[PDB]
């Protein structure tokens, strides 16, 4: 693998220390106490929170005198460290929340045995260590900050003591770091966070300078290459959600005492998390990732300055404290933790002092639809409205493989409709990276919604290039983009030569914003077989031919509701029932039935119409028009027909009331047959029952909505030359102006149609008078 070529982001390696160490600084300084011994009275949440830490059995559990040898289990070695570093840290806040006695005592005693026993006797590069850098990595904050808080009030001796035990952890962490991680994911980058932190509490140690300059760079050598400049983390939500265990508090802890803010640098893998949840806050289980919150609410306090594209006014903050409290909490209930980390943690302490009870929840108000090109996902949304069946949500998967925790997920799909999630990714595991099942089935290319060649998956052109998008298009009435992935291309594990070489080019369409279309292009340079796969997620799957509906129940997951599917061409493919695992969270594991639709061709077309419907909600009539070189057919739900048509080539066919030689075209009628929504993928014309509706002397790729008389709407995907564009105008009627972000543009009227030359796409408005 290489780890250097992908678009990731790094700040500076330069170690800024202050001149003296000042405890506390960590989180706060001593004239902050009062402050924060108050702040219980804030609101619900602050209650709730010191409500947790004020009755932590780490408060009264007996400190254990047995010391594990190294020949103990690895769970007892990795609890003994976890609560004698939890021990210090929870006593260690509440002597400065209560002056208690005890709790000084105790976080005095816990942090003189910090690292006893068998520790450096034992070898973290051994697979399941009790003292794997993960762990220790918050053991070493969980000591680190009970050390900051219980300073100064230690004796000489005891600090000396207590100096000597996180100076020695910090040495072994700096000497080892690239041994014990030697690929840069999440085993490099959290010690590296644990080091930072040490590094930052003994400030004034000779060696303070050398252990934060590697904790930098080796954080750096995994923002690099596992992040992506857009804020995406390529080892999925789980591991990003696990990183951020040791990343927030590091962050916090360079601020706050050397002064060097990376917040503004770390700003996107933030926004990452808002722009990819879906209708109850869960990112994906994409990747070897369950469903996961993102615990935004706190880094919100760092943010009050921050501009966002989620809003069209309200800063940064004010949408990640949203987008944290608007989110489904159940399937963390009753315990509550999703860290990855609840033996090790002190999330209720790190809680408490990083949220901010003054920062307004602001649903964000801009276009659900979110592009993400760096990175290579898209989001198709109605809406931001938090657990509202009415939301639709698409995630559009299509980023470059890193060689951590992948899956073959190329140019696949996920859906969350009717508050239920619905067409599926299969998963992580069962429970754990190591069950065969994650080889023989979660991370295979057949548990996704994708399309293989000969069984081979979709992949990246070269190692570390996002698939390329185009034709991304964002309005009230219809959104667009399609991918590109080869056959014969970059994956891991590492495949050189291939018997054939081919493509896919998926194209997602987001019909009313009520359901999708998925319109596949596949080019091959000989004969092979094409398996398209469809999941539809924890639901009983029913139907024959080319249709496939699944019914869901009310569980952990969401409410009843159900998911039909149409496949195109119905004639020229087969339709094969299978079952498969699909699992959201650990242990939760079952299987479903799942379609798998085959072709044997070498430049074809699939066509999937996707909608999500509530429990008692019609069936909508769809009806497969297909031929020789045209997929597509027709969709009537909620008295409308929409028409689909996808070809190979820019050829004058017809499909239904269609007639366009674009590679692509969707249109919506209303209740009374009349057009009212229409886009075209590289077209030069369009009529509609014969009727012309435009012409372009050059492909254009665009999306309009025609139904205001007094104004055509819509937009028009990015150009590469300048295209002469011809609409025709509602009959009688003149045109005033036209707008294309938001600059007029010259326009002239010819045998009543809007003539312009556009140079640039963008948003268009066609004004009209009487
Ligand atoms: C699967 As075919 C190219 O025979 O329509
Ligand atoms: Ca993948
Ligand atoms: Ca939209
Ligand atoms: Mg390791
Ligand atoms: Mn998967």
Redesign the pocket.
Known sequence: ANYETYDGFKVSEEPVLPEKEVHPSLWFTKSDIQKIKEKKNEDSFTAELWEEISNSPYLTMEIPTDIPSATDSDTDIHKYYGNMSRIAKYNAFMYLMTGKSEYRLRATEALKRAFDGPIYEMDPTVSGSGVDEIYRAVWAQNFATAYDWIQPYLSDEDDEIIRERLAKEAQVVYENLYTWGPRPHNHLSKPAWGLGTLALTLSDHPDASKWLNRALEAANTNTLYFFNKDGHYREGAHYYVYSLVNLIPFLYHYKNVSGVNYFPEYKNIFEWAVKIRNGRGWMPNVEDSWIKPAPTHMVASQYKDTDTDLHSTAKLANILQWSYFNTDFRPWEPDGSYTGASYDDTWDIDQYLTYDSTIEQIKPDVSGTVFMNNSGQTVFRSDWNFNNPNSRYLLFQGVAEADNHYHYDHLSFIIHAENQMMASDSGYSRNSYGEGIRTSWYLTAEAHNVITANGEHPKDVSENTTPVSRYDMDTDFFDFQEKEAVYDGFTFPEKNSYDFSGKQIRAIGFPRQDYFVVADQLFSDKEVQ?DLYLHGGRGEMSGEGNYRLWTYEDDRYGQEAKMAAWVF?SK??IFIDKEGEVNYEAGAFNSYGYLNAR??????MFMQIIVPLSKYADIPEVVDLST?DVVGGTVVKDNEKDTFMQQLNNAENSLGDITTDATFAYTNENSNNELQHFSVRQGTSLDYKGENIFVSNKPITFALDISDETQYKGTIAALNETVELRVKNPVGVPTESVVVNGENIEFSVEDGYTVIQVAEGGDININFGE
Request: no cysteine.
């Open positions: 094409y061409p020229e493919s072709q044997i061709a070498k430049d074809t020789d």
